[PDB]
Amino acid sequence: DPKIVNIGAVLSTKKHEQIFREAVNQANFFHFTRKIQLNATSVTHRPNAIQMALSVCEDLISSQVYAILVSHPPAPTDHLTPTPISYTAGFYRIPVIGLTTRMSIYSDKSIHLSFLRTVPPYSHQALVWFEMMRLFNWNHVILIVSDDHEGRAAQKKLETLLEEKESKADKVLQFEPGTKNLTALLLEAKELEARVIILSASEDDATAVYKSAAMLDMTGAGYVWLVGEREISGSALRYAPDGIIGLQLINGKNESAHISDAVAVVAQAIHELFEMEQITDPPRGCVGNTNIWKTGPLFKRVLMSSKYPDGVTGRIEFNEDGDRKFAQYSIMNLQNRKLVQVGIFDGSYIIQNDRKIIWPGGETERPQGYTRLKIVTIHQEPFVYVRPTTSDGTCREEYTINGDPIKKVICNGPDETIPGRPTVPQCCYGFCVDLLIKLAREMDFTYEVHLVADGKFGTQERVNNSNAAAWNGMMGELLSGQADMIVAPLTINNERAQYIEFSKPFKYQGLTILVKKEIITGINDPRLRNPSDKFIYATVKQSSVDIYFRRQVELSTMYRHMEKHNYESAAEAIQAVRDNKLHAFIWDSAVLEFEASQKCDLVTTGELFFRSGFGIGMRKDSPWKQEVSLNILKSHENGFMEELDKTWVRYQECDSRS
């Protein structure tokens, strides 16, 4: 006996309905009609969502459809006008197949779990860009996205493509839709070194994008533009820049080819389906059924795996999201302010059409693509000095003890001089500065330095939530990117080390104690071991020494005695011993010994313990550090450091007192 298995659809016009029924009949004729038969039902798009949903529940589902096809209406209303059906069929898990919805928001299985399509979304276009990026060897690009599920999805897809490679977020730029002026954001974009750009937006937004971009002359040569199908089309085409690279999906406009093919796939899927047993017909009519249709997910599973590579539209296979795979796009160029096919993209590999490549501005062939270091420091007396620039005038001609003029640079940092704390323009000169400029002559880089707002270098703290705080201080600026590189006297330790890359040590020093000479056995001093309220031993809370005390279990008892009567900064800590407020002071030698020379009223004692080194901080991801260490070593071998310590460590007046 025959069994009539209904199918349903919503299409633009009655002619296309006839096309649908014709394709269905082709499916019936060419597959066993004795065992099973396919029947076609369809309806034109309705003015609102509601008439249509009602149409699905009444006009379609009453016919017991095993699946539904949907197409974009003649006049698009808002976007994703085939939103309701995916929900409506979805309740019963009836599979839905869109012909014309390239919209990305349907890719998430969570919200639309019945949704499949014969076209890839706009997000999947990134597959091309990565391949495009792959050929031309530009690893550095910029991404401009509108803020919505569409743009963010595109970003996720491209970044996911990049994730296989070392993750590349050269830069990413988010703007929100409907915003006529975007100028500031592009002003931010120019600063980024990478000269290639890719963008996704709506036509109206794209007009504003190109309009704003042309003002800053980013449409010029040395810059490249990669874009979505929507961007080249419409009013956006009118305001579009020359030499742009663009994409168009094949048969995107045609519902009918996709109709014949989709129905062909549906037929193959069904005929493959009825090979299985324990099947159930879909619910008859919307009315009276609160329950899903157990077969529907299975129908989806076979249908996603349904092969039939030969089709009017091209190869057919479905990704996990139900989105189509191996679709073909035609690359487009703007030559002479008109659209031309420079090449065509099919499968995983691009194909180059005979037409000459165009780049923006004049190029016969020009594949061209791809500085400033923000440096941060802290106020530490031996390796850094702070004086304000006199009025507008910059820096003093003051001279080192060996006759040389002292070098100096401008640094923006915290000022306690004003009652409120402004980030204040200042002049800073140092050992680390001379080192930095030494590198700057050696290295291609240019430098701008501002001191960190917090007097502390850094320490882990606070709580946690969406906007994690992170260790307070210049280090925190490094992860945050406020400064890309850290030049200061920073001890190098594992707790920090996992988070960031560390330059080879310029200096080697260890902790020690300062006590006045004028009348501490070891790092382990019985006198420390025999603490006294009467005999103070002082340190800075949040100083790395404190991290040594907290992290280390073995001395963990000894930490607390030190914790009492802590000082905020280095100057105050030296002063207490000088003022004789505190009998002893504990800090790493490199900062301390220079002071030991500076006064000689005070002395350093014992053996450097917690032996360590000072190095320049960088993110593990940044390769410049590879050169830095390479440079640091080169600076060590020649004795450059030895002479710099010789300059900045005076050694003039002091001796072993006893």
Place this chain on the structure above:
Amino acid sequence: KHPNMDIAVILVGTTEEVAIKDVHEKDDFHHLPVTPRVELVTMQESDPKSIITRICDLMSDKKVQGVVFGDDTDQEAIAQILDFISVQTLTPILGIHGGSSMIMADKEEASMFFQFGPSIEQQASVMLNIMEEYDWYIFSIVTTYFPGYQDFENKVRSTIENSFVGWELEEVIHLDMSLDDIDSKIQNQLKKLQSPVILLYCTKEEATYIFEVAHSVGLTGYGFTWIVPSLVAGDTDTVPDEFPTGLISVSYDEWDYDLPARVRDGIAIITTAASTMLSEHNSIPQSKSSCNNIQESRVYEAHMLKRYLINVTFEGRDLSFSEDGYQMHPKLVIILLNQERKWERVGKYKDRSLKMWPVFDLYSEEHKDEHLSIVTLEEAPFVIVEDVDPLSGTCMRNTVPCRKQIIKRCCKGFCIDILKKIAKTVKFTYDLYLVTNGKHGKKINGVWNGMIGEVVTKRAYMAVGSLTINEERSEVVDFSVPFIETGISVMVSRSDKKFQRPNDFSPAFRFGTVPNGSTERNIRNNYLEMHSYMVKFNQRSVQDALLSLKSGKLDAFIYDAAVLNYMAGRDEGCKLVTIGSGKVFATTGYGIAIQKDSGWKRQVDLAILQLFGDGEMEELEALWLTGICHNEK
């Protein structure tokens, strides 16, 4: 002048045809500037077509400005449907029970929809409070592709990162119910997870399948426990027993307030929002309700209403919403599946804080298992073996029995007391015996000896004594934190390289130590000449080594610092003293053996510093360690 609003409410289910009609809407709080006009309708079973048609049908010309939905149903989907209508109408809708109250995908911002179910984030928080209360630290999450995933995963991530405790997230699993499985792919994954406490998230229907599969996998049994959000429990009226017993989940209580009271809350919210919006703009909220045509003009203006409606208060009760449209903090109840089909309440939770009833062992020692035999050795100063009174036949007072294979010997002393306090605190029982081969561990060629051997052979779990610490033994076995300051030291009557060579000094000098010691091994490792020279000066025992020092024929003696200090304090005459301040190189302390990374471990360590934490060690030092000498101080 007279501002009478237009409102509609619907009840589905209620287990009655002739469901209780218009029970409420009776004038309460009439003072509110707008008076409500209500039309009530009921429909028996839910459908997308029935609901859409009816709600639009009530819209008609009627022009209702608000809707409240309520259901007897367990269905997840319903909320979204009504929400969709809201998106279309811009007419506010909320729901007080069941599915509408059940969570839904993130609401479109333009759209207006509200639920009296708790926030997903809030629920996750409550699940965490529950686990913390029973101190179940280690857990995994099984989830499905249903909406709210990764709002849930993120919420758990945020809630978890902040806390101090060392909780473990073991696995997170995402499985699509769509592409339904022949593979039992869910069985194949679920089988993997070893974690005791599982959070599950899915649709009411999905939980059944996941649970049948878990029943096949063996995940529902014996020590593993499952914790669930609102959705799975739903109404709680109907419970397939496919769900395992002991299943723990949160839900809103029917008992506290009945459904009509809740509906009263909804009406109150709508009319309060109307009153506040009135107070602000003196403007009627009333709008044309008909869906079929374009949305009425100035309805676009309605956005501010949502802005007003988010937090609303009446009857001393806060209805305040969250951006998603869930109420910020509705009262919530911790519920469990009592044996058989019962859903019986366990906890109450409100606002910031949670309260739960059962004390312990909710739903052969439960806290811990097995037994530990211990080996020791007798120290000439520490660990003291004594011969028990034969007449008594068994040990007396502080003395604890220890056996030596060759006879019962009675051990008492520092190790015995420290061990005794530790046993009292961690509450376990133990067997103590004496070592035979090699005392403290000794290496000849390839193989270890001593108590360490019995620790390696698993003939001993933990080894206790005057045993010193070193890198090798720390490598092979985990050690307890040092209780006492000790190390290598010198004892003589009264780095210079005088030790390095005797031959530099024309008269022969003399110093020696006990062989097979950590001291001798350390010496051989760092300083060879000293070892090779001192082998001649090695002595049988500490009493005999003392004989070499005391009677003459030896100048200096070298040994453990604690023993040398106690011996400094205790001598028949004050003829013996320490070196310098007795400040010792190789600064170390007495540790305690354990097997490897698997052991009671940290629990021991805590116990130890609690001992000093109460100051007992100072007393024990004065009693056992303190010597009379060093009297002139």
